[PDB]
């Protein structure tokens, strides 16, 4: 499985696969 969170910054165990927009702002779509 990939486990993904929308974050300001991806954690050191993750990479950025794309973006989320919520609350009018961008987040990164971070998965490990
Ligand atoms: Cl794969």
Curated annotation (Swiss-Prot):
Q: Which one GO biological process term can you cite for this protein?
A: innate immune response in mucosa
Q: Which GO terms describe its molecular function?
A: protein homodimerization activity
Would the keyword Secreted turn up in this protein's UniProt record?
yes
Record keywords, A-Z: Antibiotic, Antimicrobial, Cytoplasmic vesicle, Defensin, Disulfide bond, Fungicide, Immunity, Innate immunity, Secreted, Signal
Name a single GO cellular component. Answer: Golgi lumen
> Found in which tissues?
Expressed in Paneth cells of the small intestine (at protein level).
Superkingdom classification of source: Eukaryota
Q: Where is it localised?
A: Secreted; Cytoplasmic vesicle, Secretory vesicle
Q: Which cysteines are joined by disulfide bonds?
A: 4-31, 6-20, 10-30
Question: Known post-translational modifications?
Answer: The N-terminal propeptide region suppresses self-assembly and renders DEFA6 propeptide unable to agglutinate bacteria and protect human epithelial cells from bacterial invasion.
Q: Which family does it belong to?
A: Belongs to the alpha-defensin family.
**Function, in words:** Host-defense peptide that contributes to intestinal innate immunity and mediates homeostasis at mucosal surfaces by forming higher-order oligomers that capture bacteria and prevent microbial invasion of the epithelium. After binding to bacterial surface proteins, undergoes ordered self-assembly to form fibril-like nanonets that surround and entangle bacteria and thereby prevent bacterial invasion across the epithelial barrier.
**What is its quaternary makeup?**
Homodimer. Self-assembles into higher-order oligomers termed nanonets, fibril-like structures that entrap microbes. Self-assembly into nanonets seems to protect against proteolytic digestion in duodenal fluid. Interacts with Y.enterocolitica invasin and S.typhimurium fliC/flagellin; the interaction creates an anchoring site for progressive DEFA6 self-assembly into nanonets.
Protein name in the entry = Defensin-6
């Amino acid at each position: 499985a990939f486990t993904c969170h929308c974050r300001r910054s991806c954690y050191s165990t993750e990479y950025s696969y794309g973006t989320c927009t919520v609350m009018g702002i961008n987040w990164r779509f971070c998965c490990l």
